[PDB]
Amino acid sequence: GQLEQELAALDQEIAAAEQELAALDWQIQG
């Protein structure tokens, strides 16, 4: 419960960061 809830937030944060990372990848190339 508690630990799975913490994991859910971590994976949400990782997903959001991976999304921005891919966006910056394109932006750096133009």
Add this chain to the structure above:
Amino acid sequence: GQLKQRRAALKQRIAALKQRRAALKWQIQG
């Protein structure tokens, strides 16, 4: 460039988040 700096900082945050995630999984397993 500015974008390249934000990308590097973002990659470090992802690495930190993934390490926290891995440590949490170890806590869940024991």
